[PDB]
Amino acid sequence: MKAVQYTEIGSEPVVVDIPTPTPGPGEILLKVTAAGLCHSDITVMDMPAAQYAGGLPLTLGHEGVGTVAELGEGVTGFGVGDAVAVYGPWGCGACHACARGRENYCTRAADLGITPPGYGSPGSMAEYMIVDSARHLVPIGDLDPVAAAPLTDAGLTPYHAISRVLPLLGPGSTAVVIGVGGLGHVGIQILRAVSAARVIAVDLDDDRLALAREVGADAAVKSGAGAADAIRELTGGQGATAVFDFVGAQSTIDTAQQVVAVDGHISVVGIHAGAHAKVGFWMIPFGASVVTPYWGTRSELMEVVALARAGRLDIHTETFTLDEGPAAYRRLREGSIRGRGVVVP
C-alpha cells in the first residue's frame, strides 16, 4: 500500500510502498478515507535525533477517519463498512484517568510502551491503518470524511482546552483565540456553539482574520506588539475571561498575560519549545489560572462529532493525494493552507 513516512532525521517525508497490515486479536483495520496534517507534525520532524520519539520509519497522521475494512479476532461492536474516527491519544484503558475516558492523561502509557498513531505507532496517512482496540473508534455515520478527519485533533484539542474552563464562559465573558489556523478556526466555532462568550480572534495574517470573522468571531485583530492594547480597548479594563493561545510563542503568551482577567484563564495550547507563562505575584492577575492541555478525552471526541453532525462546525480544508503529502507539508510550513490540509486516499 501507499503511505507517507518520515524516514530519516532532518529530511522531508517521502511516499513509500509498504505492506498492507492485517489486524491481530482485538485490532481493527480501517480503509482510510481522510488523514489530517497538523503543525505538530512539522515540530516532530524538526526535532533532533536525541529528542525525536516517533521511531523510524513512521507513517505520519494522527488525524484519521476511515471505514472498517477488517475485524481482528474477537472484535465486537463494529461491522465492516462502518465509518469511524480514530481516537488518537491511546492510553492503558485501566487507570483512574483512563476509566473516565481521559486517556490523554493516562499515567501508565509511557511505561507500557503505548504510543499514538502518527507518533510512535503507524498513522493514518496511508491507504489503510490499524487501530489497537474498539474503544479507540467513534462512529461518524454519514459525515463527509474530509471535514471529519480534523475533528480528531483540530477539533478535539481546542474542544478539550475550552471544556476545562467552560463554566467561566458565561454571558458577558470574553474569550480570546490566538492563531486562526487548523486548531484556532475550529476553536472559534466551538466557543460559539457551547458558550455565550464574545470571541476575539488574533492572527498575524489579515486573511486568517477574515477567516476568523467568517466562522463567527465577534472581532479579529492583528497579532504583535499592539494586540494587547487593541484587545483591552475591546474588553475595557476588565480584560479577557479566557485566552486560548494556539500559537504558544513567548510573544503570544506575553499578550495572553497582559490581557487576561482577574480569576480568568490562559490555555497554552500551541507548542513552541522554551516558551512559557510566568505565573507569579505581580506577573499575572490574581486567580488567573494557566495550563498546557493535551489532546482530549473519549467523550469529548464524541461531543466534537456531535457538533459536526449538527452543522455547528464548518471545517475549512484543502484536499491532497498521498503523492502530494510531502508538498502539503511544505504548504503547511510556509503557512499557505487556509484551515486544515487533508490527504484523501
Next chain:
Amino acid sequence: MKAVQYTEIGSEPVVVDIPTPTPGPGEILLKVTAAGLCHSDITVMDMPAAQYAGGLPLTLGHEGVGTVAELGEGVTGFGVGDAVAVYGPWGCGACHACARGRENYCTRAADLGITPPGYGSPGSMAEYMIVDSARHLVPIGDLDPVAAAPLTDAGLTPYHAISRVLPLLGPGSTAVVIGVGGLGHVGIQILRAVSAARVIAVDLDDDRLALAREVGADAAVKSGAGAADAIRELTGGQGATAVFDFVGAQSTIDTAQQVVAVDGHISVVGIHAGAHAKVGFWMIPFGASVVTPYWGTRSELMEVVALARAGRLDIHTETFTLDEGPAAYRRLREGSIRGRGVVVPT
C-alpha cells in the same frame, strides 16, 4: 485608644495613641478581641516607598475579630455585643464577582479606592476598629477570639486555594503543603476535614515538620534539594495531585513543578517577589494547572468558621499585648512563632 501602626518607610511599627473612631452611616465599630499577625505584614513593611500602597500612618492587622460596640446610622442585622469576624478583602459589593460573594476578585475595588483593613484602611491591631459594611461581618458565636482571629486569613486563604480544586482531591489523591506556618498549619487541617487526600507537609525546620504531624499531616519532608525526590518516593511516580505552596520562593515553586501530577494543580499562595511558576510544554506536566489565588470569598469565610465551630481546626497561637506588637513582628521575622501570633487588646 492604643494601636500598633506602621508610620515611616523602613521603620518598625510603633505603639501609638489615636482617637477612638465613631462609625458613620452603614459602618460598625468593633471592640477588638483579637488581631492576627501575618507574614504579608512583613512583606508590606519591607516594600520601598514607591511600591508601598498602605498609606502612612497605617494601623496594622488584617486578621480581626471583635464584639459590636456601636452601630452606624441605618445598620441592621447585628446587635451590640455580637461576636464577629471581619471579612478582609473588601470589594464594591455590586459587580459580578462581588454578587457571588467573591469580593477578593472584585473588578472595581482599585478604581473606587476600596482597600482592606490593615492595608490602606485602618486594621484590627487597636482597641477598636471600623468595618465599612455589615456584609463584611460574619458571626462567630462563642468561639474563642484568640483562635478565631486567624480564621480570617490563615484559615480563609488556604481554604480558598484548596476550594478552587477540591474536586481533584478524591480518595487516592495526594496534597503537598509547603510551609507549615500560620497559613500552612491551617491548610493541612482543612485538607483533612474537606477531602480524603493524603497530606504531605514540607518545611525547612524539623520543629515545623513536628507541628505538621501534630495537626494531621500523613508525612513530613524536609524542604530543599531532596524534597522533590522524597515526595515522589511517597507518591510512587505519579507525583502529587496538588501542591499548595505557602512559601512561594523560586525553590519551592520548582519543587512543586517537579512533583505535580499530570492533570494536577499547583497553587502558589506564598508571596516572594520575582518568583514564578514556568508553565510551558516540557516544563510542567500535561494538564497541571497553576494559579496565584488571593484571600477568599464571603461564603468561604462562613465555611471556615463552621469548621472551627465543629472542632475541625486546632489553631496554634501565641498571645501578645498591644505593647508587645512590635516585639511580636520581630518574632515573626525571625520565624519563632509556632503557628500564628495574635494580639489581644486590653
Next chain:
Amino acid sequence: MKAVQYTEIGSEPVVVDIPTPTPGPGEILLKVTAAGLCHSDITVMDMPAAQYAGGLPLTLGHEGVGTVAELGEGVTGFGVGDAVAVYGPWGCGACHACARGRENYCTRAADLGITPPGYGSPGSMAEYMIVDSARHLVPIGDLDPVAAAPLTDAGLTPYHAISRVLPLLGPGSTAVVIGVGGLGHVGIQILRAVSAARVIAVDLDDDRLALAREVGADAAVKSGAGAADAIRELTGGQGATAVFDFVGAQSTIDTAQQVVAVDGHISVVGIHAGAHAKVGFWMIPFGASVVTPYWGTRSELMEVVALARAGRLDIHTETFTLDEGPAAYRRLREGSIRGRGVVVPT
C-alpha cells in the same frame, strides 16, 4: 400616582391613585419604565384568603425596570437617571445562600418578614416603585425597557432552571421546553445561547409552536397524549437529556417522566397546585434528577442582562398602559398574549 392593585380576595385588580412614595435610608425610588405581567400573578389572585400571602392592598408587578428617580439617605452607588432592572427575590443579604447572591434560596427571609416586590411588598405596576437596597438593582444601560422588564423573571427563572444542569447539555444533548409562553419562549433562546442542546418545544397551541420555531426551537410538538411518543421519535429512544416544564400540570410532568433520559433532569418550573413528579424506582429512569427551582440569583440576572445586551434574546411583548392593566390580566388568563404582557407607565 397611578398603580394597579389587588385589593380584595377573588376580585380583579383595579387602577388606583395612591401617594408617590419617598425612599427611606438605603432605599431607591425608581420611575418605572416597564412592568411585566406574569402567570404567577393569576395564581396568586386565585388563592383563597387563607393561602394568599401578598397582603391587601398589593401593587402588582414583580418584573420591573426603571430609571433612578431619587436616592434614599446614604445610597451612593447609583446616579439619578441610571437605567436599572429590579432583582426580585429579596433575601436577608447575610446568610450563606445570600452571601453567594442566591437570595432566591435565602433561609432567613420568612423569619425577617422580607417579601418580594409584587407579592408582599409594593410592585412595579405603578408610575414609581421603591427598591429596598442597592444590591437589588442591576444596570441595563440603553436596553429598551419594554423588552428588558421580562428579563427579571421570564428571563431569570428559566435561566436559573437551565443553569442548575447546564453541564448536562453538551453537544448531542436534547432539551425539551414544555409551554411556550412568557417563560418558555425565553427559555428556548437561553438554551440556544448557552448550550449546544437540540431544543424541542411543546405546546397545546399551534401559534405558540410557531413562536417556538421563530425563537429558535429545532422542533415543535403538540402537547397531550401523543407528545411523549412524538418526542421519542425525535430523540430516538434514549429520550431527552433535560425537560424544562414551564406548565407543571400533572399531564406535562407525566410527559416529562416518560421522555427523560437515564441520568437526565426534569425541572418543574410551572406551578400547578397538587401536581408533582413521582420520583421512585420503576417510575423514572435511573439517575434522572427532578427539582422545583425558584426564581434566580443575583449573578444570574446580570448574565441574563448580558445575553440581552449581546442580542441573544428576542423578547416578544405586547404593551399596555396602567389603565389597561386589568384588561391585560384578562388577556393573560384567556391565553391571548403572544409572549409577555408589559405595562408602560406614562
Next chain:
Amino acid sequence: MKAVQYTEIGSEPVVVDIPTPTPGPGEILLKVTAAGLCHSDITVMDMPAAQYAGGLPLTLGHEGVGTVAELGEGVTGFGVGDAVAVYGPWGCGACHACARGRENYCTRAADLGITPPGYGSPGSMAEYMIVDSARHLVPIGDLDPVAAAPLTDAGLTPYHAISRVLPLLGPGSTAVVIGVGGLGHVGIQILRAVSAARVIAVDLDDDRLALAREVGADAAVKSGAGAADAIRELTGGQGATAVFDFVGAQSTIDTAQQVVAVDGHISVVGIHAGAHAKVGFWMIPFGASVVTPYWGTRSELMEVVALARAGRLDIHTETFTLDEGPAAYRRLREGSIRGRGVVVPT
C-alpha cells in the same frame, strides 16, 4: 464447583454443583475469595415470574472479589494470582456514558442483552466466576477479601449517591442517612471521609443506631413518625442539606421531604416498589433536588477501594460458607446481620 443459585420462582436459593467455567476470548476466570449478600437479592427473589429478569437458574452474588485464576484468549493487564474486585453494572463500553466509565448509566445495555453478574449473568456466590472483560476488574492489592467484597456495592452505591451532590456537603452542612444496614453503615463512613458534613443516622433498630455511632455518626435517631421533628431539633429550622435514604419506603421518603433544606437533595437509594418522592410546589422545598441513583461508576469503585486501603472504611461483616448461603439469606430477611453478610468459598 459449588454455587448458590436461585432456581425456581418463589423458592429459597439452593446449593448446587455446576461445571467450573472456562473463560472465552476477552474473559477472566476468578477464584472467588468473598461474595457479598445484598438486600436487592431478596427483592429480586420476591418478584413474581412476570417481573423477574434474572433468568433461571441464576448464580447469585453481585458483590464479588477474587484472584485471577485463568486469562481468556487475548486478555492483557492482569496476571494469574492478582487480587481483584468486580465492577458490577456492566455496560456496552462504547456509548457516551460508558466512555466516561459511567456504565451504570449505559444507554445500550438492555438492547445488547448485557446484564450484571448476579442478575442475568452468573454471580460471585460460587467457587469460581467469569468476568466478561478486563475493564470490569479493579485491583485491591492485599485488602482482606471479606471486607473488600462489600466495597463493590455496599460501598460503591452510597459512594455514587453521595458523589452526585458532594459540592453541597461543605462545612456547616448536614447529611441524614436513613437505614444503617449494609449500604448505610458504609455511607456514614464515606460522608465522614470525603466531606465535612455533620452526619445524622436514622434506623428502626437501637442496635443499628449504636452501629451508626460506632462508625462515626454525629447523632443517631429512631426512625418513624417522630424522626422528622427529632432531626429538625438537631438541625434547627434550616433542615438537612442532604438526605440519603437507604430504605426508600414511603414513610422514609416522607421523613426525607419533611427535613430536607431549601436547595438541598434527597437521594432515594433504597428500593421499595411503589414508594416515591412527590416533587412539586408546596410538597418539597424550593431547589431541593431528588433522584434515584443506580450503583456507581468505574472510577468511583477505584476511589472506594482507595478509601479502604487508606483505613477510612471499617466494614462490618459476618462470614458464611457456600453451604450456609441459603441460611444467610434467611438471616438477611429477618434483619439479623449486623452490617454485611459475606460468603467465603473454601
